[PDB]
Every structure is written in C-alpha cells, then in structure tokens.
Amino acid sequence: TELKIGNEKVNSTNFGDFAEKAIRGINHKPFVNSKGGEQKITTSKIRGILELVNKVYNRVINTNDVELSENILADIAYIKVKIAYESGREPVVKDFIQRTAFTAAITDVMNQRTRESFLLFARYVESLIAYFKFYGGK
C-alpha cells in the first residue's frame, strides 16, 4: 500500500483515479518532438515493459510471502533498467514514463520490497493502460 508516485501517493482506493487523470493529462497538451510533435505513445512502444511487468506479476501472484524474494527483485530491477532503456530510445516514451511515474512506482516497490506494494503497482499499471486505451489506443 501507500505507493509513492513522486508527488502524490496511491493506494487500493486511489490508483484508478490517478491513472485516469494522468492519461487525460497525456491527451491534454501531448508530447512535442523537435519538429513540433505531435504524436502520442503506442502499445507497441512499451509492450516489452508491459510483458516484463506481466511476467513478474505472474511470478509474485504465485507466492504467498509478504516480502519479495531476491530472484523477483532482480526481475523488477531489470524492469526498471528496461524502462530506462526505451525511455532513452525515444522521447515519446520518456515523457510517458515521467508524467505517469512508472519509474517512481518501480523505485517505491524496490524499496518497500513487499508483495502488496508490487500488487498495487501492477494494478496501477493495468489501470494506466486501460485508460490509455478507450481514450487514445494504438
């Protein structure tokens, strides 16, 4: 619980509202390139990150321990490394990660090191993608 997103925290009763707010703020004044924008992110630009998050979620959901094991924390660290990778690979993903704080949530999970923290992060990510679609998509 109490997952820090940098500015304001989220919990089991909050993640959907903040995910929707972040996605709506994505559509309001979207990303601008060097050549004046004006595209948004697509699913097949963070699909690898989403697949890694899904794999780690499957691994965690099959464990009843309240504390994440080091073998799973390695997976979350690799998730953060990859997020840094595609963030620098293209700026359309960098601002998407910055404004919808994937990195802050990953760091908070890697600090709390608890099963519930990662479950809340996964729920927040799922809500983020769900609101990204039905408003944008692709």
Partner 1 sequence: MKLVIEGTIVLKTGMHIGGSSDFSAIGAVDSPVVRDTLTRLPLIPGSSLKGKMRYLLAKELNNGILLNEPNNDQDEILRLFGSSEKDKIRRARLKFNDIKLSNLAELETFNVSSTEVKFENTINRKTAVANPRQIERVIAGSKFDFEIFYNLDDIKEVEKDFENIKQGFDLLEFDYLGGHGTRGSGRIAFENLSVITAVGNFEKINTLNEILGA
Partner RNA sequence: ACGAGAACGCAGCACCAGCUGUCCAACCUGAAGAAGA
Partner RNA sequence: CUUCUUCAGGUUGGACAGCUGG
Q: In DSSP terms, which residues pair with 114 in a beta bridge? A: 67
From 23-31, 95-103, 106-114, 128-136, span contacting partner 1 (CB under 8 A): 128-136
Query: CB of 15: closest distance to partner 1 in angstroms?
Result: 12
Rounded to whole angstroms, how far apart are CA atoms 73 and 61? 14
Which residue ranges make up the site for a copy of itself (CB under 8 A)? Answer: 11-17, 19-20, 70-71, 73-74, 77-78, 80-82, 84-85, 87-89, 94, 110, 123, 126-127, 129-135, 137
Which residue ranges make up the site for partner 1 (CB under 8 A)? Answer: 43-44, 46-48, 50-51, 54-55, 57-58, 61-62, 64, 71, 81-82, 85, 119, 122, 125-130
